[PDB]
Amino acid sequence: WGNLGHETVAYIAQSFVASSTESFCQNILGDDSTSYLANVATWADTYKYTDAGEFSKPYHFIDAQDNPPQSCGVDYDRDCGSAGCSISAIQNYTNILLESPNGSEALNALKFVVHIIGDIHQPLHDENLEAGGNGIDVTYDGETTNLHHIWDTNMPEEAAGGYSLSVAKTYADLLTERIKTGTYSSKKDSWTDGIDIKDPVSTSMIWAADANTYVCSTVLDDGLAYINSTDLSGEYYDKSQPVFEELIAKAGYRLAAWLDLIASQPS
């Protein structure tokens, strides 16, 4: 996602973490504001453009070598690759926070986890075709862009009504309501099935596989004749909106559950 989606994921997670988890994170981040996770949720996307952070570019995605929309699937050993991926990064940075939470690496590990759990839930961050859809040029509200970009940025920002941190906070409030009492309230109790702090790869692969299903059902079902030739701000946006909203909600809810397990200690 772009910045709005990552900040939204982070604000949702803040609404679901335990108090002890909130304290654990605020202490690592040096931030006890009511934006502590949202304030770092975009860091990985600035870091990756620097010489020191170039190593981390591949950590934003897992390039699933499936065949959408006919067939979707993610395979860690097939798809991660030698340079690492979102799944290998979740393992590495989770284990830093479990083993060395008071050490110098915990700060960036936490900022990576906050960001990357968000990215796992962007379906085109779980898809090899055309580099996650970057190579698929599209028109969106009369503008030339690409299919990856409209999932990251154009569509979530249209739905949220803007791009800023305060717009993200409002959007997160909306999606948090849908989890607690609204749209998602009868589904969300299943959203952490399979979670296992002892197996970060298995856990994050369940999430990536979930998001990847929507590459076939939603991102590409209409087919590329339609997608290449049509302004995607109309009916394509209308069908995409419920899907990216639920995936942003899932990312925040799952990030909260994961941070709770990272911070957990038996009383």
Ligand X SMILES: *[C@@H]1O[C@H](CO)[C@@H](O)[C@H](O)[C@H]1NC(C)=O
In 10 A of CB 213, how many CB atoms?
A: 16
Q: How far apart, in whole angstroms, are the C-alpha atoms of residue 90 and residue 117?
A: 8
Q: Using the rule CB under 6 A, is 43 a contact of ligand C5P?
A: no
**Contact set for ligand C5P, span 78-137 (CB under 6 A):** 124-125, 131-132, 134
User: Is 205:74 a contact under the CB 8 Å cutoff?
Assistant: yes
Using CB atoms, what's the residue nearest to ligand C5P?
Answer: 132
**Contact set for ligand C5P, span 146-175 (CB under 6 A):** 148, 152
Nearer to Ca ion, 16 or 140 (CB): 16
Q: Which two tokens stand for residue 118?
A: 């968000």
Residue count, binding to ligand X (CB under 6 A): 9
Element (H, E) at 139: strand 137-140
Nearer to Ca ion, 128 or 233 (CB): 128
Element (H, E) at 144: strand 143-146
Q: How far apart, in whole angstroms, are the C-alpha atoms of residue 37 and residue 176?
A: 15
136 is in an annotated binding site: no
| Per-residue 3-state assignment (H helix, E strand, C coil) for 194-239 | CCCCCCHHHHHHHHHHHHHHHHHHHHCCCCHHHHHHCECCCHHHHH
Q: Using the rule CB under 6 A, is 225 a contact of ligand X?
A: yes
Q: How far apart, in whole angstroms, are the C-alpha atoms of residue 13 and residue 33?
A: 14
Q: Any residues with CB less than 8 A from the CB of 227 and at least 6 apart, and which?
A: 136, 138, 147, 220, 236
User: Is 192:82 a contact under the CB 8 Å cutoff?
Assistant: no
Q: How far apart, in whole angstroms, are the C-alpha atoms of residue 262 and residue 197?
A: 7
- Which of Ca ion, ligand C5P, Zn ion, none does 16 bind, CB closer than 5 to 8 A by kind? Ca ion
Choose the binding region for ligand X from 38-46, 84-92, 143-151, 245-253 (rule: CB under 6 A): 84-92
- Which of ligand X, Ca ion, Zn ion, none does 152 bind, CB closer than 5 to 8 A by kind? Zn ion
Choose the binding region for ligand C5P from 59-67, 69-77, 87-95, 172-180 (rule: CB under 6 A): 59-67
73 is in an annotated binding site: yes
201 is in an annotated binding site: no
Min. distance of Cβ 147 from ligand C5P in angstroms? 10
Q: Using the rule CB under 6 A, is 61 a contact of ligand C5P?
A: yes
Nearer to Ca ion, 120 or 160 (CB): 120
Nearer to ligand C5P, 120 or 159 (CB): 120
Q: Which residues form the interface with Zn ion (CB under 5 A)?
A: 1, 60, 119, 152
62 is in an annotated binding site: yes
Q: How many residues does the chain have?
A: 267
Min. distance of Cβ 36 from Zn ion in angstroms? 19
Q: Supply φ then ψ for residue 63, to 5 degrees.
A: -80, 80
Using CB under 6 A, list all residues that contact ligand X.
84, 88, 92, 105, 108, 136, 224-225, 228
Binding residue numbers for substrate: 1-6, 45-51, 60-63, 73-78
